[model samples]
Target: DKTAEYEKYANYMNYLYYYQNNELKKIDSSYFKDKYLGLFFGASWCKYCVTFIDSLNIFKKNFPNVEIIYIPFDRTYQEYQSFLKNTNFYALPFDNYLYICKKYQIKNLPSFMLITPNNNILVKDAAQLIKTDEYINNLKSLIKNYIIHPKTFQFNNRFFDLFRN
Candidate 1:
């Protein structure tokens, strides 16, 4: 079931590449199972993404079980390459620029959606969760025990209504 479910969204991504040990290797979806998936919307054409990338470098370094996949929205491969220099994270190849980002409704440079294997989004705007202690403490329990701690589950700001009552 995990395989089938993972393939559903992964259908748009024919080529998944992960950077490791100075190499970008073509990977199969089977390598993606059994971990929390972070769909990262990355922008190679701007400066706003700089800070988040560094923060994320530390975030990811602390947790290797969570998989991060770059969903590129830029046109230049070179810039994306240099951007990826900050961390050895997995990515949905440039070809997915037209599909996954569209499905995820990405409008910003560096936003993230933490999802489960069955295509359900667990935490939205994970970029904000970088230095937070909530996810760090409950990340394992949520996966292992399927016990959700209230503080650990957060959604994107778009879901909030800021207007008057």
Candidate 2:
């Protein structure tokens, strides 16, 4: 349903490292080579994201393995700083965000995206992805979840053995 406009640029990546001067940057798919990735979607003054970013910052400190990338949709300077009290997450400025929001069909702010190096988007909404204990638990569990693998089977018997074993 949200594909027609995004399908062409869906997989593409963009970044905004500066918000004050409005500098936008584009990143290659290879940039997301981290175990855990967070795509931050919020403006500088978003009250909702202030708490969310705070929570995420704590989560990041607890789990330093994840790579957090900020994609600010900042509407004002106070809003931007309000969200960056002590954040260390990599950020993209507002200028870049405008283009991306339009490209990606982002209808709201305080959005969070959990992505992988393969460009597979795991979690798309911040509130929905982290609202319940299940979502929070899954964040950590993803580490173990992806570990299990379907070992390659050269023979049909070997493949069949997977069920038995």
Candidate 3:
């Protein structure tokens, strides 16, 4: 199942974008190392997004090794820039990377799609999944048991297929 998801979206993820010094820049998919990639979809106008941002900051602190990629849905360049200014998180340029939003089926204001480095979707709705104790413990367990390579932690064998390429 995970391999199918990666095979489906692998090619499309050839490139990703993020803002550095408030300037938009393109990034190659290979820029990501062998770690979980968290794609956060949200916008400046969303109320739930605002609340989620607060929690996201805390989550980042707790799991500093996790790779988080923000995908904004802001309508204007200024709005997107404004949102990024308040946080240290990196985000895909608002107007340009809209295709990723659609491809990932971002119907909700604040959604999190956790994937492997090779683009295999893990927890598709990580926003809700994060609220559960099970998810929290899973992360904790990874750090405890896999201290040498905690970032490469996986729940099953499907993770191995992600690196076949």
Candidate 4:
């Protein structure tokens, strides 16, 4: 049933837009493989949403591989862009434009839905897993597979003088 639900919106997902490198870009949702997808629902007008965004930033630092896609519930496009800029994550283009909120049956603010690469819903509500015991254990397990270690660092910059005062 969930898979069928996901397939219903597969077309919209394929054309989703996200902010990256100071610009909005389009990406294929199906291209995401072997990564956990966090569907974050929040708005700039809500003070409590700030706390959730902070948690998401920390989550990103620790996991780094998990994809947290924000779903805005703002009043206008400008407000949506502002929230997206502040949060700095992939997001749906419009507020429930494709009826994602309806499909997910969202009933509250600052909520999250964690999905798998195969479009399976892992957790309907991720608030409990945000900064709780389950979060740490699950992050540790997921991080193990995609942890990247830099072999070396290059500090020598030819244009270093350009940035030095």
- Clashing residue pairs in all predictions, respectively, total 0, 5, 0, 0
Candidate 4, lDDT over the whole model: 0.64
- The lDDT of each candidate is 0.61, 0.55, 0.65, 0.64
After aligning candidate 1 to the native by TM-score, how far in Å is the CA of 162 from where it should be? Answer: 29
Estimate, for each residue in 53-143, the C-alpha lDDT of model 4 and write its tens digit. Answer: 7778777787676788777788888888777766678876774533565666778888877665444566777765876535777657654
Write the number of the candidate with greater lDDT, choosing between 2 and 4: 4
lDDT of model 2 at residue 10?
A: 36
TM-scores for candidates 1 onward, in order: 0.68, 0.58, 0.65, 0.68
Cα RMSD of all models vs. native, in order, equals 9.3, 11.2, 7.7, 13.9
Write one digit per residue (lDDT tens) for candidate 2, span 72-157: 67777566554544565566543444655665567877777765543445666655656444555666777557643333422322
- Considering only N, C-alpha and C atoms within 3 Å, which residue pairs clash in candidate 1? none
Worst 10 residues of 4 by lDDT: 156-165
lDDT of the structure predicted as candidate 2 = 0.55
TM-score of 4: 0.68
* TM-score of predicted structure 3: 0.65
